[PDB]
């Protein structure tokens, strides 16, 4: 419940 989705811009 504590994990956020990663953001990964090129």
């Amino acid at each position, epitope marked *: 419940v*504590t*994990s956020a*989705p*990663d*953001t990964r811009p090129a």
Partner: antibody, heavy 115, light 114 residues
Framework: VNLEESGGGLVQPGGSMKLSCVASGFTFSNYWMNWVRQSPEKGLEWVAQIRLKSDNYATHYAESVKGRFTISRDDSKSSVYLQMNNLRAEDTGIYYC???????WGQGTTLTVSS | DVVMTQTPLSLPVSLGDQASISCRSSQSLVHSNGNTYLHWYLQKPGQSPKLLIYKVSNRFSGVPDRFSGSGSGTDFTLKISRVEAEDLGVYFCSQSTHVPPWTFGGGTKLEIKR
């Protein structure tokens, strides 16, 4: 939920050590697993992360341990491991196994690096 | 690296009164998805930390209803209402928004005024 750690104790500088953690009570295979260490000097410090099968077992490491520590998991044993090489005095502290960031915590094992 | 700062170092509260613990971040913890990944933990004496509140305000499993979390951006507060003696320990905050690394506050000790 229970996470039980093993390994640790006194290691000489430059030496190696493997911590282990066995978990029960949650769906281990769908949680990122982590090691977190606790020391008077640094407080709580996240050390290493291992992700899922789906993620091809992707990993992240703290700057202070990159290249010396290896995190791994065994979904068949509900276990996570921390292999540590070239240990330094600064690696001393209480190491916790965790599921999530940070849903579930183990009871901790202690590592001391000294001659 | 997000710096998490916790105040006060120690908090004195009478049983049954309300305690408020503060957590500050060096940067806003709002994530692109609009959620805020700020969590609270309690480390009772001689135990490991345990998750209390996740995403600012959600009570975790087994967490009594006197724990509530609030805040936004860089400024967060845990409130413990109707404080019981079993609530004493060190309260930590952590952030999962800007990672790696996942980072922690330095902890606040709840002291019961008896």
């Amino acid at each position: 939920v229970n996470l039980e750690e093993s390994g640790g104790g006194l290691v000489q500088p430059g030496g190696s050590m493997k911590l282990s953690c066995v978990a029960s009570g949650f769906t281990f295979s769908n949680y990122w697993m982590n090691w977190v260490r606790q020391s008077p000097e640094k407080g709580l410090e996240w050390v290493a992360q291992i992700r899922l099968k789906s993620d091809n077992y992707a990993t992240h490491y703290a700057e202070s341990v990159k290249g010396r520590f290896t995190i791994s998991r065994d979904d068949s044993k509900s276990s996570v491991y921390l292999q540590m090489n070239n240990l330094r005095a600064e690696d001393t502290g209480i190491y916790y196994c965790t599921g999530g960031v940070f849903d579930y915590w183990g009871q901790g094992t202690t590592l001391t690096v000294s001659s | 690296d997000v710096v998490m700062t916790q105040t006060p170092l120690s908090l004195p509260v009478s049983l049954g009164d309300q305690a408020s613990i503060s957590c500050r971040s060096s940067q806003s913890l709002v994530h692109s998805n609009g959620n805020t990944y700020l969590h609270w933990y309690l480390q009772k004496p001689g135990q490991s930390p345990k998750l209390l509140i996740y995403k600012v305000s959600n009570r975790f499993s087994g967490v009594p209803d006197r724990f509530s979390g609030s805040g936004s951006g860089t400024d967060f507060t845990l409130k413990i209402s109707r404080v019981e003696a079993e609530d004493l320990g060190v309260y930590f905050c952590s952030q999962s928004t800007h990672v790696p690394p996942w980072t922690f506050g330095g902890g606040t000790k709840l002291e019961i005024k008896r």
